[PDB]
Amino acid sequence: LPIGINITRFQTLAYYVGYLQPRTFLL
Amino acid sequence: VVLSFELLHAPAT
């Protein structure tokens, strides 16, 4: 989506939350 | 009819 204004937080409407770090994988 | 053309920082589509 080309929406792309700005984002800092979120929430939902059983479930899990992880975060993403800059890693390096071998696929 | 006047046509305005915006070019702010956005994914221009």
Q: With an 8 Å Cβ cutoff, are B13 and A4 in contact?
A: no
Nearest chain A residue to B10 by CA: give it.
A4
| CA distance linking residue B7 with residue B11, whole number of Å | 10
Q: Which residues of A touch B10 (CB under 8 A)?
A: 2, 4
> In units of Å, what resolution does this entry have?
2.6
The answer to whether the beta carbons of residues B9 and A5 sit under 8 Å apart is: no
Nearest to B11 by CA among A4, A13, A26: A4
The answer to whether the beta carbons of residues A2 and B11 sit under 8 Å apart is: yes
Is A2 at the interface with chain B, CB within 8 A?
yes
C-alpha distances out from residue A4 to A15, A19, A25, A26, B3, Å:
26, 19, 27, 30, 24
Is A6 at the interface with chain B, CB within 8 A?
no
**Which tokens in the block code for residue A13?**
């409407």
Experimental method: cryo-EM
Residue A16 is which amino acid? Y
